[PDB]
Amino acid sequence: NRPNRLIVDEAINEDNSVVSLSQPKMDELQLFRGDTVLLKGKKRREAVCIVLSDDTCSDEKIRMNRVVRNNLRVRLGDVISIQPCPDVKYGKRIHVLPIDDTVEGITGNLFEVYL
Amino acid sequence: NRPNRLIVDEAINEDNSVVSLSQPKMDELQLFRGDTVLLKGKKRREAVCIVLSDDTCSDEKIRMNRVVRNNLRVRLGDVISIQPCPDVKYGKRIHVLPIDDTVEGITGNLFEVYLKPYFLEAYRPIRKGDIFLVRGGMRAVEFKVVETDPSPYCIVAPDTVIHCEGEPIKREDEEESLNEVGYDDIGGCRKQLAQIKEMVELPLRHPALFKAIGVKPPRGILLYGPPGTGKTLIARAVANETGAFFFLINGPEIMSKLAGESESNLRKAFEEAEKNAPAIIFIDELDAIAPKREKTHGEVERRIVSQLLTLMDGLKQRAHVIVMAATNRPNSIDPALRRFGRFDREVDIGIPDATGRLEILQIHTKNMKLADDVDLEQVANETHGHVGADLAALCSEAALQAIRKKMDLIDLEDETIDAEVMNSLAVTMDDFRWALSQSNPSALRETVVEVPQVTWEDIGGLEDVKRELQELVQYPVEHPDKFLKFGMTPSKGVLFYGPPGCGKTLLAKAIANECQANAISIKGPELLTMWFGESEANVREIFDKARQAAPCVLFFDELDSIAKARGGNIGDGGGAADRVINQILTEMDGMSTKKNVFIIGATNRPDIIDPAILRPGRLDQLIYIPLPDEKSRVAILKANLRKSPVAKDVDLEFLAKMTNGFSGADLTEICQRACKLAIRESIESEIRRERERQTNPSAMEVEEDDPVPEIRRDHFEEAMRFARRSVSDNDIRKYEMFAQTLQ
Numbered sequence: 001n002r003p004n005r006l007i008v009d010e011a012i013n014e015d016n017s018v019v020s021l022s023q024p025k026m027d028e029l030q031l032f033r034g035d036t037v038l039l040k041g042k043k044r045r046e047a048v049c050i051v052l053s054d055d056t057c058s059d060e061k062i063r064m065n066r067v068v069r070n071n072l073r074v075r076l077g078d079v080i081s082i083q084p085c086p087d088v089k090y091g092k093r094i095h096v097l098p099i100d101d102t103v104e105g106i107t108g109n110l111f112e113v114y115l
Numbered sequence: 116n117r118p119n120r121l122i123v124d125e126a127i128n129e130d131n132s133v134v135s136l137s138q139p140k141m142d143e144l145q146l147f148r149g150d151t152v153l154l155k156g157k158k159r160r161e162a163v164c165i166v167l168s169d170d171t172c173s174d175e176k177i178r179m180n181r182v183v184r185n186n187l188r189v190r191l192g193d194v195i196s197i198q199p200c201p202d203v204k205y206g207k208r209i210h211v212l213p214i215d216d217t218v219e220g221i222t223g224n225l226f227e228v229y230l231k232p233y234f235l236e237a238y239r240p241i242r243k244g245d246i247f248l249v250r251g252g253m254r255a256v257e258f259k260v261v262e263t264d265p266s267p268y269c270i271v272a273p274d275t276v277i278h279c280e281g282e283p284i285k286r287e288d289e290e291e292s293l294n295e296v297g298y299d300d301i302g303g304c305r306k307q308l309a310q311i312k313e314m315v316e317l318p319l320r321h322p323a324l325f326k327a328i329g330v331k332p333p334r335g336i337l338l339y340g341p342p343g344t345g346k347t348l349i350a351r352a353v354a355n356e357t358g359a360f361f362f363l364i365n366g367p368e369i370m371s372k373l374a375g376e377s378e379s380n381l382r383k384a385f386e387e388a389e390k391n392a393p394a395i396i397f398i399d400e401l402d403a404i405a406p407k408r409e410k411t412h413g414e415v416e417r418r419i420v421s422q423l424l425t426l427m428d429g430l431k432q433r434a435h436v437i438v439m440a441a442t443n444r445p446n447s448i449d450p451a452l453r454r455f456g457r458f459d460r461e462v463d464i465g466i467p468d469a470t471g472r473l474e475i476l477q478i479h480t481k482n483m484k485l486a487d488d489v490d491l492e493q494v495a496n497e498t499h500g501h502v503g504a505d506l507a508a509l510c511s512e513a514a515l516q517a518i519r520k521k522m523d524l525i526d527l528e529d530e531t532i533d534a535e536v537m538n539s540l541a542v543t544m545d546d547f548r549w550a551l552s553q554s555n556p557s558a559l560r561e562t563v564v565e566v567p568q569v570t571w572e573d574i575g576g577l578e579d580v581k582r583e584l585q586e587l588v589q590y591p592v593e594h595p596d597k598f599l600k601f602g603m604t605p606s607k608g609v610l611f612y613g614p615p616g617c618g619k620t621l622l623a624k625a626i627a628n629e630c631q632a633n634a635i636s637i638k639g640p641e642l643l644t645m646w647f648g649e650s651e652a653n654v655r656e657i658f659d660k661a662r663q664a665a666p667c668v669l670f671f672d673e674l675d676s677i678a679k680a681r682g683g684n685i686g687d688g689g690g691a692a693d694r695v696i697n698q699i700l701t702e703m704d705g706m707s708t709k710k711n712v713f714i715i716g717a718t719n720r721p722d723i724i725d726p727a728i729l730r731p732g733r734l735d736q737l738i739y740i741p742l743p744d745e746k747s748r749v750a751i752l753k754a755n756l757r758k759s760p761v762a763k764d765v766d767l768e769f770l771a772k773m774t775n776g777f778s779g780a781d782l783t784e785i786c787q788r789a790c791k792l793a794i795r796e797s798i799e800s801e802i803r804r805e806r807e808r809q810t811n812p813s814a815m816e817v818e819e820d821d822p823v824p825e826i827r828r829d830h831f832e833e834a835m836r837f838a839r840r841s842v843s844d845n846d847i848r849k850y851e852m853f854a855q856t857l858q
């Protein structure tokens with residue numbers, strides 16, 4: 001019944017925009033860790049991330065962290081699709097900016113040191 | 116045999132407006148055709164409408180759209196009483212409003228959508244409170260009552276105004292219908308419910324008879340028992356089943372107000388019960404309003420207790436108002452309430468038993484689908500200390516364990532809410548085992564008063580003793596007249612003495628099982644707890660309980676424990692008296708021979724017990740329980756082995772003769788050890804078998820011929836070496852010397 005959608009679960013890796021899936025469902029979708037894959041989510045937002053194949057997480061369940069789920073506007077128990085995107089590009093300058101008051105009371109050339 | 120006494124049976128017309136007929140019964144009736152016939156069922160409800168669309172079936176029974184089994188009745192066995200009352204007025208319009216489903220889907224105007232094709236020359240000949248299935252669709256939606264232009268039932272006509280702008284839902288009447296619980300909702304209390312029925316049925320149902328003559332109604336019924344035993348439910352069930360109005364009051368809402376407003380609310384509540392007579396007033400958790408006088412600290416907390424007492428005494432004039440209260444124990448409230456005119460009747464709800472627990476399980480799991488392997492009898496056997504609500508929680512928890520364990524991710528996003536998943540789902544035994552085993556801390560530590568299950572056949576020997584027990588216990592209740600004729604006063608006590616582990620605790624239960632009486636067991640540790648705690652008042656609470664559950668048997672064992680604690684028989688100091696046996700004697704002497712309460716005592720050191728307990732009265736009969744004989748030993752062996760597969764080459768008769776002086780306890784240990792050896796061998800074999808073929812490069816090998824289906828002679832041979840005697844000939848010589856010196 002469409003082994004593309006999938007349910008959420010917690011994560012172990014601390015890296016951001018990273019995931020891991022059970023070992024058998026790597027040919028079912030037929031794509032490997034290095035394969036950059038896009039994932040769907042509500043309010044019509046889809047985010048691309050690296051991929052990996054693990055064991056602990058069940059075939060029906062994905063692993064990720066708050067960093068990604070926030071922008072994805074998705075919570076646990078929810079379900080999402082998935083699609084490989086080997087068409088990804090070696091991106092050039094891609095503009096960023098700090099978005100918070102976290103910058104409150106700070107100095108120094110944060111750019112280098114932090115990024 | 117009443118001419119208008121006839122049963123009701125199946126029906127085939129789905130428009131309940133129809134009321135049936137039976138020509139053999141009609142000829143005895145004056146039933147006319149037209150709008151309405153006044154029919155009468157139970158608990159004051161009714162359903163009146165057009166008549167005589169029947170006689171398709173035989174006679175002697177009435178037909179009616181099956182809806183009249185939920186409304187106006189419950190089930191078969193009832194008896195319709197259909198007397199016509201035609202030519203009724205025609206009000207403006209009669210309570211046009213559905214209740215349950217008309218909200219789901221297109222609501223429209225709720226009049227010109229579904230029901231308009233019904234009242235066409237049958238303009239709602241209907242009573243207020245009637246409910247039946249009517250739709251312009253799936254053909255099943257109920258109907259209820261909001262508007263009442265005339266007071267009684269009437270008939271509608273065109274050119275009338277409807278007020279259905281209201282919203283369907285559970286109406287006051289609908290909440291009242293669930294509230295119309297009935298006696299089916301209660302299970303596990305067979306005696307108390309009958310006691311309440313006999314107490315209040317006459318005053319509420321038949322006031323006129325009490326008006327004619329002088330009899331005292333029940334002024335106050337105090338139901339005391341642990342929480343979660345269905346007390347307010349009992350009050351609602353009793354009030355509804357007699358048609359009497361029911362009013363509910365709660366303690367917290369009376370003590371969470373300002374000074375005068377609480378008294379004002381109490382007065383208003385009492386007033387609102389005298390204008391709906393015959394009615395009932397129910398107060399729960401009375402301990403929050405009227406605690407012990409010493410406990411009550413403050414001024415406004417006594418102004419609310421005197422007000423209640425004054426209100427109670429203002430009811431002698433009116434015999435049609437009854438008050439029922441609920442608490443845990445009676446000694447938790449001011450005794451002033453317990454009087455002759457305020458609260459004179461008392462009831463102990465108590466605790467259910469295996470039968471009551473099974474009944475509660477059945478009621479709770481009515482709509483819970485259980486596929487298989489759900490006996491519900493072993494569950495009742497394994498629930499010791501559960502009351503009411505707890506079992507309900509059980510029923511829910513196991514059900515959750517059914518869905519949570521595996522449906523965790525299936526129902527997340529694959530489908531929306533559907534019934535093909537809910538109904539296809541079932542509940543198994545492992546869910547109940549997990550619920551009961553894991554997360555069920557029983558909320559009971561109180562003593563239990565209930566009949567045991569031990570029969571006489573469980574005792575190997577002591578044939579002569581059972582005859583004496585019959586003579587002493589059963590005859591006074593069986594044949595009181597013969598005892599009175601000879602000017603004789605029966606004894607009320609007996610004391611057992613003998614070596615340990617010879618079968619003294621079982622007789623107290625077998626006698627009660629034969630006599631069908633409750634039994635109470637009190638151990639030695641409780642006596643030492645009272646001694647160290649210096650709390651002898653609890654003894655009273657024991658005897659009081661024994662008086663409430665008459666007929667019953669009261670059992671004390673390890674009576675020598677206190678005399679043992681303070682030194683030996685000589686003792687470190689003092690004599691043979693103490694502060695706990697004196698109270699026991701005081702309670703014993705102040706007790707009538709009536710009420711059929713028997714007392715039994717057990718010990719193994721009769722030399723140290725107080726002689727005052729052996730005087731005429733108290734316990735005057737002494738019985739000596741000896742070690743079993745070889746035949747008794749084979750009998751005990753069969754009794755102990757009756758619940759295990761032990762078919763073996765060896766013969767229990769062989770074992771018994773080899774034993775010499777073995778007590779009953781020793782014979783219940785050989786079986787356990789032999790079965791332990793057998794189960795250990797079985798587990799070792801199973802682990803080795805499950806391990807070999809998978810550790811070995813053998814994918815699939817199947818063999819499950821039970822290596823240990825029964826206890827063979829080898830296990831008993833091994834066990835016989837590990838068991839010996841547990842007594843000495845000196846103890847037997849002491850017992851014989853006492854049995855001889857008594858002369």
Ligand SMILES: Nc1ncnc2c1ncn2[C@@H]1O[C@H](COP(=O)(O)OP(=O)(O)O)[C@@H](O)[C@H]1O
Pocket residue numbers: 573574575576614615616617618619620621672717743751754778779780783
């Ligand atoms: N006649 C008997 N029949 C069956 N079991 C017995 C008999 N006599 C003793 N027993 C065993 O002894 C145990 C009860 O010991 P009990 O008689 O209460 O000891 P005490 O006499 O010290 O109170 C039970 O577990 C039971 O199996």
